[PDB]
Swiss-Prot record:
Hydrolyzes phosphodiester bonds in RNA, poly- and oligoribonucleotides resulting in 3'-nucleoside monophosphates via 2',3'-cyclophosphate intermediates. One of its GO terms (molecular function) is RNA binding. The active site is at E71 (proton acceptor), H100 (proton donor). It comes from Bacillus amyloliquefaciens. Introduced by genetic manipulation and expressed in male sterile maize and rape by Plant Genetic Systems and in radicchio rosso by Bejo Zaden. Barnase expressed in transgenic plants will specifically destroy the tissue(s) where it is expressed. After cell transformation, protein expression and plant regeneration, the active nuclease destroys the pollen producing organs thus rendering the plant sterile. One of its GO terms (cellular component) is extracellular region. Belongs to the ribonuclease N1/T1 family. Keywords: Endonuclease, Genetically modified food, Hydrolase, Nuclease, Secreted, Signal. This is Ribonuclease. Changing H100Q: Loss of activity. The chain holds residues 50 to 157 of 157 of the full protein. It is found in: Secreted.
């Protein structure tokens, strides 16, 4: 299962899409994911949330015309989601956060 910062960052930049273990918030919800129950690994075994558009309303990540940002959970295996996310742009810039979107650092 590819869910580490280096593994997913290297997959995105080579394959230009997330690996097969990622499903969106909406897709997980439809499968029965209930965030306050921390049951993602029960209803969608082996999957992590990812692929959703990240608004970047706050302007923390660098903006550019035509640039859209998406997010994916990293280091997830079971229980409640954690605070680790990879942020990737349509032009393939890659950032990480480990503090639940408070701060980001570039990783590619």
């Amino acid at each position: 299962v590819i869910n580490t910062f280096d593994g997913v960052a290297d997959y995105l930049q080579t394959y230009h899409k997330l690996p097969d273990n990622y499903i969106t918030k909406s897709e997980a919800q439809a499968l029965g994911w209930v965030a306050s129950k921390g049951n993602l690994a029960d209803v969608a075994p082996g999957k992590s949330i990812g692929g959703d558009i990240f608004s970047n309303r706050e302007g923390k990540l660098p903006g550019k015309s035509g640039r859209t940002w998406r997010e994916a959970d990293i280091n997830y295996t079971s229980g409640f989601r954690n605070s680790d996310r990879i942020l990737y742009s349509s032009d393939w810039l890659i950032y990480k956060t480990t503090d639940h979107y408070q701060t980001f650092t570039k990783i590619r």
